[PDB]
Enzyme design. Sequence first.
Site, PDB file in Angstrom:
ATOM      1  N   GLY A 194       0.828  -1.195   0.000  1.00  0.00           N
ATOM      2  CA  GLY A 194       0.000   0.000   0.000  1.00  0.00           C
ATOM      3  C   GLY A 194       0.862   1.244   0.000  1.00  0.00           C
ATOM      4  O   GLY A 194       2.074   1.170  -0.221  1.00  0.00           O
ATOM      5  N   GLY A 245       2.283   4.500   2.126  1.00  0.00           N
ATOM      6  CA  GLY A 245       2.522   5.196   3.382  1.00  0.00           C
ATOM      7  C   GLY A 245       2.287   6.673   3.142  1.00  0.00           C
ATOM      8  O   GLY A 245       1.654   7.049   2.149  1.00  0.00           O
ATOM      9  N   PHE A 282       3.899   9.816   1.714  1.00  0.00           N
ATOM     10  CA  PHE A 282       4.999  10.231   0.809  1.00  0.00           C
ATOM     11  C   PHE A 282       5.903   9.074   0.327  1.00  0.00           C
ATOM     12  O   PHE A 282       7.105   9.246   0.094  1.00  0.00           O
ATOM     13  CB  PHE A 282       5.824  11.370   1.433  1.00  0.00           C
ATOM     14  CG  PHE A 282       5.076  12.678   1.545  1.00  0.00           C
ATOM     15  CD1 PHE A 282       5.244  13.677   0.582  1.00  0.00           C
ATOM     16  CD2 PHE A 282       4.209  12.918   2.614  1.00  0.00           C
ATOM     17  CE1 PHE A 282       4.557  14.891   0.673  1.00  0.00           C
ATOM     18  CE2 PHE A 282       3.515  14.122   2.715  1.00  0.00           C
ATOM     19  CZ  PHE A 282       3.690  15.112   1.744  1.00  0.00           C
ATOM     20  N   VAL A 303       4.945   1.425   0.018  1.00  0.00           N
ATOM     21  CA  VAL A 303       5.410   0.346   0.876  1.00  0.00           C
ATOM     22  C   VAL A 303       5.237  -1.039   0.226  1.00  0.00           C
ATOM     23  O   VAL A 303       4.153  -1.409  -0.242  1.00  0.00           O
ATOM     24  CB  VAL A 303       4.709   0.375   2.262  1.00  0.00           C
ATOM     25  CG1 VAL A 303       5.301  -0.679   3.191  1.00  0.00           C
ATOM     26  CG2 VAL A 303       4.822   1.773   2.908  1.00  0.00           C
ATOM     27  N   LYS A 330       9.649   0.607   2.562  1.00  0.00           N
ATOM     28  CA  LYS A 330       9.012   1.821   2.099  1.00  0.00           C
ATOM     29  C   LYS A 330      10.003   2.585   1.246  1.00  0.00           C
ATOM     30  O   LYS A 330      11.103   2.908   1.684  1.00  0.00           O
ATOM     31  CB  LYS A 330       8.492   2.666   3.262  1.00  0.00           C
ATOM     32  CG  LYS A 330       7.743   3.935   2.838  1.00  0.00           C
ATOM     33  CD  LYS A 330       7.062   4.643   4.023  1.00  0.00           C
ATOM     34  CE  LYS A 330       6.515   6.004   3.600  1.00  0.00           C
ATOM     35  NZ  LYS A 330       6.147   6.868   4.771  1.00  0.00           N
ATOM     36  N   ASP A 359       1.015  12.680  12.060  1.00  0.00           N
ATOM     37  CA  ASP A 359       0.165  11.887  11.170  1.00  0.00           C
ATOM     38  C   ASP A 359      -0.335  10.605  11.803  1.00  0.00           C
ATOM     39  O   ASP A 359      -0.502   9.579  11.132  1.00  0.00           O
ATOM     40  CB  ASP A 359       0.883  11.589   9.846  1.00  0.00           C
ATOM     41  CG  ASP A 359      -0.069  11.103   8.753  1.00  0.00           C
ATOM     42  OD1 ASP A 359       0.427  10.431   7.817  1.00  0.00           O
ATOM     43  OD2 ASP A 359      -1.301  11.373   8.834  1.00  0.00           O
ATOM     44  N   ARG A 382      -4.680   4.160   9.878  1.00  0.00           N
ATOM     45  CA  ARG A 382      -3.881   3.761   8.702  1.00  0.00           C
ATOM     46  C   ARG A 382      -2.369   3.730   8.934  1.00  0.00           C
ATOM     47  O   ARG A 382      -1.646   3.234   8.075  1.00  0.00           O
ATOM     48  CB  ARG A 382      -4.178   4.658   7.482  1.00  0.00           C
ATOM     49  CG  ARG A 382      -3.523   6.024   7.539  1.00  0.00           C
ATOM     50  CD  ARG A 382      -4.018   6.944   6.398  1.00  0.00           C
ATOM     51  NE  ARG A 382      -3.742   8.338   6.754  1.00  0.00           N
ATOM     52  CZ  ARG A 382      -4.584   9.121   7.425  1.00  0.00           C
ATOM     53  NH1 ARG A 382      -5.781   8.678   7.773  1.00  0.00           N
ATOM     54  NH2 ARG A 382      -4.244  10.361   7.721  1.00  0.00           N
ATOM     55  N   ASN A 383      -1.898   4.256  10.070  1.00  0.00           N
ATOM     56  CA  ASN A 383      -0.466   4.291  10.383  1.00  0.00           C
ATOM     57  C   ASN A 383      -0.095   3.510  11.632  1.00  0.00           C
ATOM     58  O   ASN A 383       0.971   3.705  12.225  1.00  0.00           O
ATOM     59  CB  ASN A 383       0.039   5.741  10.446  1.00  0.00           C
ATOM     60  CG  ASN A 383       0.070   6.385   9.078  1.00  0.00           C
ATOM     61  OD1 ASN A 383       0.380   5.716   8.085  1.00  0.00           O
ATOM     62  ND2 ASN A 383      -0.284   7.658   9.001  1.00  0.00           N
ATOM     63  N   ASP A 442       5.088   4.376   9.945  1.00  0.00           N
ATOM     64  CA  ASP A 442       5.159   5.313   8.829  1.00  0.00           C
ATOM     65  C   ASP A 442       6.124   6.464   9.039  1.00  0.00           C
ATOM     66  O   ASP A 442       7.188   6.519   8.395  1.00  0.00           O
ATOM     67  CB  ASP A 442       3.793   5.824   8.381  1.00  0.00           C
ATOM     68  CG  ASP A 442       3.876   6.525   7.060  1.00  0.00           C
ATOM     69  OD1 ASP A 442       4.122   7.757   7.058  1.00  0.00           O
ATOM     70  OD2 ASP A 442       3.761   5.832   6.025  1.00  0.00           O
TER      71      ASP A 442
HETATM   72  O1  LIG Z   1       2.458   3.092   6.040  1.00  0.00           O
HETATM   73  C1  LIG Z   1       1.361   2.983   6.952  1.00  0.00           C
HETATM   74  C2  LIG Z   1       0.979   1.532   7.273  1.00  0.00           C
HETATM   75  O2  LIG Z   1       1.588   0.628   6.352  1.00  0.00           O
HETATM   76  C3  LIG Z   1       0.757  -0.437   5.901  1.00  0.00           C
HETATM   77  C4  LIG Z   1       1.660  -1.389   5.123  1.00  0.00           C
HETATM   78  N1  LIG Z   1       2.180  -2.517   5.932  1.00  0.00           N
HETATM   79  C5  LIG Z   1       1.558  -3.728   6.014  1.00  0.00           C
HETATM   80  C6  LIG Z   1       2.274  -4.578   6.781  1.00  0.00           C
HETATM   81  C7  LIG Z   1       3.457  -3.861   7.221  1.00  0.00           C
HETATM   82  N2  LIG Z   1       4.515  -4.184   7.989  1.00  0.00           N
HETATM   83  C8  LIG Z   1       5.470  -3.303   8.218  1.00  0.00           C
HETATM   84  N3  LIG Z   1       5.423  -2.065   7.716  1.00  0.00           N
HETATM   85  C9  LIG Z   1       4.402  -1.657   6.938  1.00  0.00           C
HETATM   86  N4  LIG Z   1       4.366  -0.364   6.427  1.00  0.00           N
HETATM   87  C10 LIG Z   1       5.429   0.532   6.594  1.00  0.00           C
HETATM   88  C11 LIG Z   1       5.170   1.794   7.128  1.00  0.00           C
HETATM   89  N5  LIG Z   1       6.127   2.686   7.305  1.00  0.00           N
HETATM   90  C12 LIG Z   1       7.375   2.421   7.006  1.00  0.00           C
HETATM   91  O3  LIG Z   1       8.307   3.392   7.229  1.00  0.00           O
HETATM   92  C13 LIG Z   1       9.027   3.441   8.392  1.00  0.00           C
HETATM   93  C14 LIG Z   1       8.970   2.438   9.357  1.00  0.00           C
HETATM   94  C15 LIG Z   1       9.735   2.518  10.517  1.00  0.00           C
HETATM   95  C16 LIG Z   1      10.573   3.597  10.737  1.00  0.00           C
HETATM   96  C17 LIG Z   1      10.633   4.588   9.768  1.00  0.00           C
HETATM   97  C18 LIG Z   1      11.541   5.755  10.005  1.00  0.00           C
HETATM   98  F1  LIG Z   1      11.664   6.587   8.912  1.00  0.00           F
HETATM   99  F2  LIG Z   1      11.013   6.547  10.995  1.00  0.00           F
HETATM  100  F3  LIG Z   1      12.790   5.266  10.377  1.00  0.00           F
HETATM  101  C19 LIG Z   1       9.877   4.513   8.607  1.00  0.00           C
HETATM  102  C20 LIG Z   1       7.716   1.174   6.462  1.00  0.00           C
HETATM  103 CL1  LIG Z   1       9.354   0.821   6.042  1.00  0.00          CL
HETATM  104  C21 LIG Z   1       6.737   0.210   6.251  1.00  0.00           C
HETATM  105  C22 LIG Z   1       3.357  -2.565   6.655  1.00  0.00           C
END
Ligand SMILES: OCCOCCn1ccc2ncnc(Nc3cnc(Oc4cccc(C(F)(F)F)c4)c(Cl)c3)c21
Length: 286
Positions: free
Chosen positions: A22, A24, A26, A29, A48, A140, A144-145, A158
């Site tokens: 899906g 995130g 900006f 992912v 992402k 945010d 959804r996050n 996110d």
């Molecule tokens: O993006 C909002 C929710 O994501 C749904 C997608 N999704 C489904 C399963 C799943 N498992 C892990 N992550 C997902 N999404 C996702 C969201 N944000 C991300 O960015 C960051 C994650 C951790 C830390 C940081 C940061 F920048 F702060 F270091 C960014 C990623 Cl990589 C995956 C999932």
Amino acid sequence: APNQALLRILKETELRKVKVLGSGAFGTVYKGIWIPDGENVKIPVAIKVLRENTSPKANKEILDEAYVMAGVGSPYVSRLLGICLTSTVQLVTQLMPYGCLLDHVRENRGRLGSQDLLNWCMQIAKGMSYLEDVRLVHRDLAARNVLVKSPNHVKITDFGLARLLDIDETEYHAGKVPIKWMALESILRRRFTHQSDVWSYGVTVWELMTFGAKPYDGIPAREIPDLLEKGERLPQPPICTIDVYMIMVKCWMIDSECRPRFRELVSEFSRMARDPQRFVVIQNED
Ligand SMILES: OCCOCCn1ccc2ncnc(Nc3cnc(Oc4cccc(C(F)(F)F)c4)c(Cl)c3)c21
């Protein structure tokens, strides 16, 4: 404190994109598989991938988020496993098998209990409490996050709009924003504090207690400010006792000083989780 957080800088070839999970904030992912260098294990990940056009400001913000999220912190925040710094930045994190909480509640509408909903509200508050301690304003926070690791375990994620506040800075001055989750002072004066995160927290809890209804559904986003200044708020979800709804209402006070602190939301939702049927009337979903 010596912050011994390990940050992995990965080559793109360690990752394999397998499925699109899906969007995130900006960035796109992907589900994937990380094979760490020097290891033969296949680790399930979310990857992402951010916009390719990134200003210095943006790169600095990405690295702040990475500096905070690499830590072993709350179990209720998603941890950054590593970054891949190609032309385009790729952020790598542990895949959460149950997807985002928003989808989970919508598609488990018929089976989720009082205890679940209340635990999640507590855990999200605990996650945000932690982020507050590390000076991170999410900006945010929304269903959804948040992700579901397992039915009893959520994680805030996110961080696409997240800003690290410097020492004795208490507000971020703000780019596209989630109007229907935002505190009035954020919409009007682009001021973002931990207290405007509390407002967003209240909309998140509303989302969960409505099983993923859209806040202010059908109401244009331009009318939201006006609506809020005229004292309207999101209505009591059928399953909320006044107890739970009052806390929500408290999150959406126009004066940000009259809103709960995240440590209070922790204690209040922990108290309610102890006797869930007293505070969430799940049968009202019918
Ligand atoms: O993006 C909002 C929710 O994501 C749904 C997608 N999704 C489904 C399963 C799943 N498992 C892990 N992550 C997902 N999404 C996702 C969201 N944000 C991300 O960015 C960051 C994650 C951790 C830390 C940081 C940061 F920048 F702060 F270091 C960014 C990623 Cl990589 C995956 C999932």
